[PDB]
């Protein structure tokens, strides 16, 4: 229950070795503009803007491509594959390299990279070049910003009341709703309806669920902008690729926040994807061992990326082999591979503390690719808004 670990360590990706050559600069292309961007060939990821993506590139063609990007814009395209086998992709996200390190260990040139999602895009065309490396003709998808739902109606005499400044939080939210949505009486709907489409109210409702996962402040950790908050929450929601792609396709932060709240309330169980009916854990065991939330992307020693969701308890898992601290994503913990007891598919790893004074003494790191969010009782699947 108590976290006697340094929450800032997994975000640093300290397992990638010595300090990388950090970049300060930031690049952004105009909305709706068309850009040709290189795609990394073995990256099988669906990246969210604001999400950190660590990589280890081994192939000389991949290493060359990154050396060129580091000198130029530092931006590559991360395709959201609808069909991974036939490499089909209609959407994706740009990724900007913010840290890198080249190593000629043993006698093999390998490059470790830390990138971040920046802009969503629509794939216009894909062509593999005579070198074997492919380029994507892309169109930068704009982020739909809507004004206050009350802006259209709003009485000009109440415009000066739209800025709002120990005491009872429920009484505060009651006053917030009465003042922000007073002009709802000029329309066909009540104040309480407009609250369901209000960024600050939706963000406060999400914060109430995020507080159940992390014992950390809104003040620092969480962003203020609905766009950034909605993407930060999307990055740490353990959902399957079909749902994540639909979530990514949403252009409005209001619809994204509403959609996330609905997933967070409906999907309370997490099953094995191959079994579909083997419960591994529930949302009540989810907890944040990293500042970015319960789930983040990490890279293994062979470049394989795993979005790892940390939980207190997991069931229906077999442990393969003995624990190892080799390349551990949670410094101070040893990992043991964990499979589903029914289908034997890899679900994640069990992390066990190296010192007695550490807390928690054990937890599980589950790979998102192996999980399936489930809604118990007598209902199948749906993502409203």
């Amino acid at each position: 229950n108590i976290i006697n670990f340094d929450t800032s360590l997994p975000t640093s990706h300290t397992y990638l070795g010595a300090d990388m050559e950090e970049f300060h600069g930031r690049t952004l292309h105009d909305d709706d503009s068309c850009q040709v961007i290189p795609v990394l060939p073995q990256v099988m990821m669906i990246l969210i803007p604001g999400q950190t993506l660590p990589l280890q590139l081994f192939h000389p063609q991949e290493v060359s491509m990154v050396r060129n990007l580091i000198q130029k814009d530092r931006t590559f395209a991360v395709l959201a594959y609808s069909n991974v086998q036939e490499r089909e992709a209609q959407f994706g996200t740009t990724a900007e390299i913010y840290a890198y390190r080249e190593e000629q260990d043993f006698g093999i040139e390998i490059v470790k990279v830390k990138a971040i999602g920046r802009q969503r895009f629509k794939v216009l065309e894909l062509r593999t070049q005579s070198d074997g490396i492919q380029q994507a003709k892309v169109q930068i998808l704009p982020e739909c910003v809507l004004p206050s739902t009350m802006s259209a109606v709003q009485l000009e005499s109440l415009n000066k009341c739209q800025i709002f400044p120990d005491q009872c939080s429920y009484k505060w939210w009651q006053k917030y709703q009465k003042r922000k949505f007073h002009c709802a009486n000029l329309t066909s709907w009540p104040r309480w309806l407009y609250s369901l489409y209000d960024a600050e109210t939706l963000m406060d409702r999400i914060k109430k669920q995020l507080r159940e996962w992390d014992e950390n402040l809104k003040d620092d950790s969480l962003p203020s902008n609905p766009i950034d908050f909605s993407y930060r929450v999307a990055a740490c929601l353990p959902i399957d690729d079909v749902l994540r792609i639909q979530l990514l396709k949403i252009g409005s932060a209001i619809q994204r926040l509403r959609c996330e709240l609905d997933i967070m309330n409906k999907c309370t169980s997490l099953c094995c994807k191959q079994c579909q009916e083997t419960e591994i854990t529930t949302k009540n065991e989810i907890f944040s061992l990293s500042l970015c939330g319960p789930m983040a992307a990490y890279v293994n020693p062979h470049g394989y990326v795993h979005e790892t969701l940390t939980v207190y308890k997991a069931c229906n898992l077999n442990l393969i082999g003995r624990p190892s601290t080799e390349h551990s994503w949670f410094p101070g913990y040893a990992w043991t591979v964990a499979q589903c007891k029914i289908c034997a598919s890899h679900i994640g790893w069990k992390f066990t503390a190296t010192k007695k004074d550490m807390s928690p003494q054990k937890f599980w790191g589950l790979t998102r690719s192996a999980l399936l969010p489930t809604i118990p009782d007598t209902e199948d699947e749906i993502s409203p808004d």
Binding site: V84, N300, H302, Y304, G321, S324, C343, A344, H346
Partner: peptide
Amino acid sequence: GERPFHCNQCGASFTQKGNLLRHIKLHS
């Protein structure tokens, strides 16, 4: 201490090669 056959994706360590090859074929 045996287990000289590791899966480069999850890190599963196997004592025989026929055991690792069955495990790697379960991944995507």
